[PDB]
Nucleic acid binder design. Structure first.
Lengths: 63, 63, 57, 57
DNA sequence: CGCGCGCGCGCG
DNA sequence: CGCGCGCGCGCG
C-alpha cells in the first residue's frame, strides 16, 4: 500500500536515522511489512540504508 | 488477535498439513503474523509441527 | 558429504551454475545453494555474477 | 579473532555463561552469542541448559 | 529470478 | 529472557 509507504517516510522525515525496530514499533505494523517497503523504497531511491557489519541496517530519507 | 488464531486453525481444519506458506498466502496475512500465532498455538498444545532437517516446518491441528 | 560432492563436481567441471550442479547431483536447488554459500564463507568456492556462476578456491 | 578470544576465555575459566564472556571480553552479547553458536556448529564448543552454559569441545 | 531463508524474536 | 536474527524472499 502507498499509505504504508507514506507513513514510513513520514516517520523517517520526523525522526531521521532509524532501524526497522523503531519504525514498526511506532507505526504498529509488522516488521516484515515495514522491511518490504523499506527495501522497495531503497530500490526507487527514496530511502537509503547504512549497515555496519553484523548490525541492523539504519535507514533514512534520501531527501 | 483471537480472530487470526481462529482463521489459522480453521485453515488447518479444512486443509490439514500445511507450511506457513500455504496459510499466509490463503489468509492474506503476513508470514510473520502467521508464524507468531503458529508458535503460540504450539505452546498451548493446539497445533503441532514436524520438521525434516533444513525444510519448512509442516503444521497441523492437534485435534 | 553434500559439500564433498559439490566441490567434486566443481573440481571436475569448473565454472558451474547452481542449475548445472543440482541437476547432475540429483539435489534440491535450495540444498545446493545453502552449501555453496557456506563454502563461500569458508573461502572454498567463489561466485561470479545475476545467475551466479560458481567455482573452487 | 573474536572466536579465538572466546575459546581462550573458555580454555582458562571453563563453564561460562554468555554474560561471563561478554563482560570480560568487552563485547556485545549478540556478538558473543553469534560466535558461540557458530563454534557449536563447528563442534568446538557445547552448551548445557535456559541460561545456557558454554564450554570447549 | 539474484534466493542461501529456518525466523516465531518482542529482548531493554 | 531461551535470542544466535541480518530476513526484504513472493520463487513455481
Amino acid at each position: 500500500e502507498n499509505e504504508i509507504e507514506m507513513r514510513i517516510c513520514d516517520y523517517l522525515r520526523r525522526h531521521g536515522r532509524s532501524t526497522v525496530q523503531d519504525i514498526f514499533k511506532e507505526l504498529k505494523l509488522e516488521k516484515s511489512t515495514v522491511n518490504r517497503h523499506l527495501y522497495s523504497l531503497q530500490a526507487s531511491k527514496q530511502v537509503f540504508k547504512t549497515v555496519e557489519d553484523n548490525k541492523r541496517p539504519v535507514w533514512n530519507l534520501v531527501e
